[PDB]
Design a binder for this molecule. Structure first.
Ligand SMILES: OC[C@H]1O[C@H](O[C@H]2[C@@H](O)[C@H](O)[C@@H](CO)O[C@@H]2O)[C@@H](O)[C@@H](O)[C@@H]1O
Ligand SMILES: OC[C@H]1O[C@H](O[C@H]2[C@@H](O)[C@H](O)[C@@H](CO)O[C@@H]2O)[C@@H](O)[C@@H](O)[C@@H]1O
Ligand SMILES: [Ca+2]
Ligand SMILES: [Ca+2]
Ligand SMILES: [Ca+2]
Ligand SMILES: [Ca+2]
Ligand SMILES: [Ca+2]
Ligand SMILES: [Ca+2]
Ligand SMILES: [Ca+2]
Ligand SMILES: [Ca+2]
Ligand SMILES: [Ca+2]
Lengths: 154, 153, 154
């Protein structure tokens, strides 16, 4: 029974690592995870194109809320982090009025525009922000703020 | 046959432990004792908010119950280049009677600055740590960065 | 077959940790890794000596580009991170004109000095910066900017 205890201690090591890893994910990086996706808040004030490049560098894109569950998760994430606004992956940069997600997939029936939005304010708003409530608002791409990236587990 | 398989697994866990240790120390710049982990949160908050934030992370505001802990926190504060942070000490329930965040009572060990605690203007029921490592009572509604503490259960 | 499943599940745990660890390295910390080394950008404006101390506290040193591959990696890292300049581990602090790496190992034939560099401008330039292009330039040690640390895998 020499290997028995070596392996018991091994189990302990793996348990330990799992716990510390979970800690790093939750307490430090404050990440958010679904069954199929990971969501990450980056607390660096940037402009839209810079943000999309930063998300891409991390091997992801700006977050795309295509359904209620995602959007609600993002809203909760924003809530706990205690922020008013972040960039997300929606824009009508190519064709004004025609909004699309960061991956170029077209806009659909689901949305979360705040009342009166999108309003293309001063004909200079082609990017999209999410606010505390979870609602969307179009804003100027040259605006600078924090952002959220989205990752596929593939 | 099973021995070398186990050895190779040992190698894998060694590897993972090392990379994880790297992530903890070099990247996240956290601080670790044999039994505890300490984390600086650089978000300006009021005391109760800070404590809630620590709790949400499954911890509490840092409790320096001995010299080693306190000195560690002081060094951490030094490296981060900060003047003050909230820590887990208060006399919110009974004025003059200080306690740690986990409600465990105050002891002989302390690191009060000269003249502290002074309950300035009868509105100071929370505690800050400063660069030197000394303590000071301050108003709970004050807003600043804070330090959380985590047990390795 | 009770032990079989416990072992299978532990295996799953180790695979899982491997993936999540890789994620934390790449997506969160945005580090760059070679077979033998890890490179880390620190986004805190500091002076050379402070930067070196910070790297040391992390158990490393300021980055040392001793060959073309390293230097090019550092350059790409800088580029994507969207930075103009960072400190690196090169200086002639001890003996003017005689440049050395942070680990005190002497300068060699390989270099990436910009045109006209190093020029010891106003006899007050004893530290080295890397710029977007990947080129080197000597600068005053009292200058404040971001820096890059380098780590051995042992
Ligand atoms: O900075 C002013 C204001 O800008 C944001 O909203 C702008 C625009 O996108 C809205 O459609 C209209 C409607 O009120 O107002 C602004 O032009 C908001 O995010 C707001 O919080 C911000 O203060
Ligand atoms: O703007 C040119 C250059 O300025 C700074 O470099 C200084 C010095 O170190 C250089 O040797 C000389 C070359 O003429 O110029 C300056 O005095 C750096 O900030 C550099 O990035 C910049 O391109
Ligand atoms: Ca427009
Ligand atoms: Ca528009
Ligand atoms: Ca708008
Ligand atoms: Ca009081
Ligand atoms: Ca008091
Ligand atoms: Ca006081
Ligand atoms: Ca000189
Ligand atoms: Ca010089
Ligand atoms: Ca120069």
């Amino acid at each position: 029974s020499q290997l028995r205890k070596a392996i018991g201690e091994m189990d302990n090591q793996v348990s330990q690592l799992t716990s510390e890893l979970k800690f790093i994910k939750n307490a430090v990086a404050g990440v958010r995870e679904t069954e199929s996706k990971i969501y990450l808040l980056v607390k660096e004030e940037k402009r839209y194109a810079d943000a999309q490049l930063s998300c891409q560098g991390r091997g992801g894109t700006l977050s795309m809320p295509k359904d209620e569950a995602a959007n609600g998760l993002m809203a909760a994430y924003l809530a706990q982090a205690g922020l008013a606004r972040v960039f997300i992956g929606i824009n009508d940069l190519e064709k004004e009025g025609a909004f699309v997600y960061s991956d170029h997939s077209p806009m659909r029936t689901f949305n979360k525009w705040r009342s009166g939005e999108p309003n293309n304010a001063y004909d200079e708003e082609d990017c999209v922000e999410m606010v505390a409530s979870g609602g969307w608002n179009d804003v100027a791409c040259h605006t600078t703020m924090y952002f959220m990236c989205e990752f596929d587990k593939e």
